[model samples]
Target: MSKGEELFTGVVPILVELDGDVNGHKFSVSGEGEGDATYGKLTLKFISTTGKLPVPWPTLVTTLVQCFSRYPDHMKRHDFFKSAMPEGYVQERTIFFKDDGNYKTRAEVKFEGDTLVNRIELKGIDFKEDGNILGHKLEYNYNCHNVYIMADKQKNGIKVNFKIRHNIEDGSVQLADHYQQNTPIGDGPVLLPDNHYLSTCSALSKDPNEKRDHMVLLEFVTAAG
Candidate 1:
């Protein structure tokens, strides 16, 4: 069968044991013996067809250790939520700005008693004047609307990737067509501030089925002018 795109390799589970001789996709059959061959090769031989298909950078964020992050407390009739930090502490996100300023977006963290901690988050942005053909200018006009999106990044300088989407008036296009136009470090005009920072932790959530409900905190204390 022809297929759609990727992410894995598997043998495929089956309730009934596959009778390879009867199966098609991955099956086995006897080879026509070139003169004088007794019923040999009792086991399988190949059939046909075969085919198949982040580097985390250092950031302002830290990843806190979630000890048992899994609970064995249920084993002893208790809710063992790895070191619960009921004595919770607090921090926050406090920024968003212009070319010459600083801003915080979606920053989060949490802890109790002693915070042997590490943390982090996500950002997408827009702007007025020359944000960069930004959202418009580039369609046929490209880069006119100057949408300045502050992508959250690590190092001193910020880097942004830019590409064009054809239809935004309710439609879609295949993503395979685009290559690297590489929207380099966005507008020097659409600048970020002198300070950028973040940190966060992870722990079990109220719903154990989910891996975690992050214990997040943030602090952005700016000048009082």
Candidate 2:
């Protein structure tokens, strides 16, 4: 009934931008069963014009280091990738929970010292959708460690608050069209705003109290759908 590519296969493909102004896109995860075994392989390219562009900061840092080095080969069908950062900016960020629903995941990254910081993992499973899987709803997990240093100890560097909770089965659909003031994320299909340097206002709030609410700032830039 709702297999939708196992809910979205391995899901980390974020090249969302703002300051550098790819325009105004959005993406956020850490949910759905540890990222469906690391599914990957995706692409996002867009830049002909959207609002502002005089881009050239080392060619937008070599196009965001080749758009985060193709997110570990677009998840390499669940093999996972992107690890080791901080010698300037380390890494490790697997994301499969696409369009929401695939046995899900939302791993994070931030390698280097003090253990690099901002590490996370969110998983969720158990569904029925009918096709007879029995009445499921027991798979759930959330782990957060050093996220931006607890977002600089909550609200210091900007903001932070992620306790998290999930029950399952209840109307099941929420979150709709956000991004009121900061609207851009240019290109299309979700992650296309790669105007180089990236980060400034980012988007997707449509403001229903900032759509679902959670630490409301210091997101720098990086969200795919």
- Write one digit per residue (lDDT tens) for candidate 1, span 116-175: 221222222332233221222211111111111122234322222222222222333211
* Backbone clashes counted, model 2: 36
lDDT of 1: 0.18
RMSD of model 1 against the true structure: 26.2
lDDT of 2 by residue, 125-205 (tens): 332243111233312221111111111112111121111122233524211111101111111111212212211221111
Q: Pick the lDDT winner.
A: 2
Q: In terms of TM-score, how similar is model 2 to the real structure?
A: 0.19
